[PDB]
Amino acid sequence: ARARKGALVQCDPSIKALILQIDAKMSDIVLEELDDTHLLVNPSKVEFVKHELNRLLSKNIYNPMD
């Protein structure tokens, strides 16, 4: 009977935990935890939530191979 607007994010559980860490560091990110592979996230952050993801997967991967 209620309807709220958000951003449905579908990803693997590891990326879900990473997004929960983004919400744990910056706040005002994740609105709800739907299941193991979905999340309700503030739309105005999605691009950021994406870009930061790249950053946190750029700090994790390393691999300069030089």
Binding site: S14, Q21, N60, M65
Partner: protein
């Protein structure tokens, strides 16, 4: 072997005043090249070794040539001594015995007689990749001959000191390509393969909350690594091939060893039990999966088991694992029409250890070996004997890993 005469042609070119490094596989006959050079020079030859088994092998090569008992071929060790004679000599010494500092067991004078009387003329250093260290610089600083030779199999290290050997002993003269040698002699085809196993959520968040070497205790103890490990073990046992499991960590080797119910060899282990496990691996067909640590790999390499599994690993020591892997690969030679050697690297996604194992695979690319990635071989879903496949066993294993973190 043709490449051995290709190396001896350089000695046949100039003759006098020469020094360099010759790269030959462990399965090749570099000791035969040392014997031939000793026959060409005919002088007091000293062979620097780090283990007594290599001394016994060099003595066996001396027996393959001629003479060892008469007062000419000497033996230097911490147990006994043997006299020598000029104009011709063959002796093997230990790095730790010649180095030392002030500890003495009334034997450093016996070495300072071989170094004081000036009975030399040919230098042979086994495994030159270990030379980058102060003790070896002291050994070179306490010796001086007319011709020097460096027998080694590898030289990949990240200490940025391998280039110094170009002036400490001499620049590398001949580097044999292991692929062309594989065409000359089937030294087991190298199939490099990384197994990408999924990572659970709890071990992922706990893995991120951990750091340093403690997070390795959360990277190895992943349930999917146990499931894929059992799948590879049962698969190789179904193919009728023996399995060798490597692990840089002793605790993980004991965990997988006790959970798989197979013999294990690690540090502080009695030598009689090690020899018993070796004989059971050589003769008993019921033991086709052994768990070997660095002690079981550096001391002895067996020509059996075409299945090599890698689980535990340490940061930076990827080149050493590539050298040991190369030793197990070169140790398997018998000229077979098939002869497919399989190296598996059990790695989990989003972990800090796979990104160094990729550097190890880069070392495996520099050698010309073939590398391919493997996400998952279909067949593990049909194995009901897999452990830690149920959420109950995954939670219990999680509690065990948490207790292990509380102990460390």
């Amino acid at each position: 072997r043709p490449y051995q005469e290709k190396s001896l042609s350089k000695m046949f070119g100039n003759g006098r005043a020469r020094s360099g490094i010759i790269v030959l596989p462990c399965g090749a006959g570099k000791t035969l090249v040392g014997i031939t050079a000793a026959c060409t020079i005919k002088k007091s030859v000293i062979v620097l070794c780090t283990s007594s088994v290599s001394v016994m092998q060099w003595r066996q090569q001396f027996l393959x040539x001629x003479x060892x008992x008469x007062x000419x071929x000497x033996x230097x060790x911490x147990x006994x001594x043997x006299x020598x004679x000029x104009x011709x000599x063959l002796v093997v010494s230990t790095y730790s015995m010649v180095a030392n500092x002030x500890x003495x067991x009334x034997x450093x004078x016996x070495x300072x007689x071989x170094x004081x009387x000036x009975x030399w003329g040919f230098i042979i250093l086994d495994e030159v990749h270990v030379v980058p260290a102060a003790m070896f610089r002291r050994v070179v600083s306490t010796i001086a001959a007319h011709a020097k030779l460096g027998l080694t199999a590898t030289l990949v290290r990240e200490d940025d000191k391998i280039g110094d050997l170009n002036f400490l002993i001499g620049p590398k003269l001949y580097e044999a390509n292991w692929m062309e040698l594989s065409q000359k002699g089937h030294i087991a085809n190298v199939q490099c393969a990384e197994v990408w196993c999924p990572m659970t959520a709890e071990f992922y968040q706990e893995y991120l909350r951990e750091t340093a070497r403690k997070r390795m205790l959360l990277y190895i103890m992943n349930p999917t690594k146990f499931q894929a490990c059992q799948f590879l073990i049962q698969y190789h046992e179904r193919r009728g091939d023996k399995i060798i499991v490597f692990s840089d960590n002793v605790y993980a080797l004991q965990e997988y060893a006790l959970k798989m119910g197979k013999p294990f060899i690690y540090g502080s282990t009695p030598q009689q039990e090690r020899m018993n496990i070796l004989q059971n691996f050589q003769y008993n067909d019921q033991i086709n999966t052994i768990f070997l640590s660095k002690v079981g790999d550096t001391s002895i390499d067996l020509p059996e088991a075409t299945c090599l599994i890698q689980i535990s690993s340490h940061y930076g020591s990827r080149r050493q694992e590539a050298q040991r892997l190369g030793r197990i690969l070169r140790a398997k030679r018998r000229n077979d029409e098939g002869f497919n050697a399989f190296f598996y690297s059990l790695v989990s996604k989003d972990t800090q250890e796979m990104y160094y194992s990729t550097k190890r695979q880069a070392f495996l690319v520099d050698q010309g070996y073939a590398f391919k990635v493997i996400t998952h071989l279909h067949g593990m879903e049909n194995i009901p004997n897999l452990a830690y496949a149920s959420p109950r066993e995954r939670r219990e294993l999680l509690q065990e890993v948490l207790l292990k973190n509380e102990e460390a």
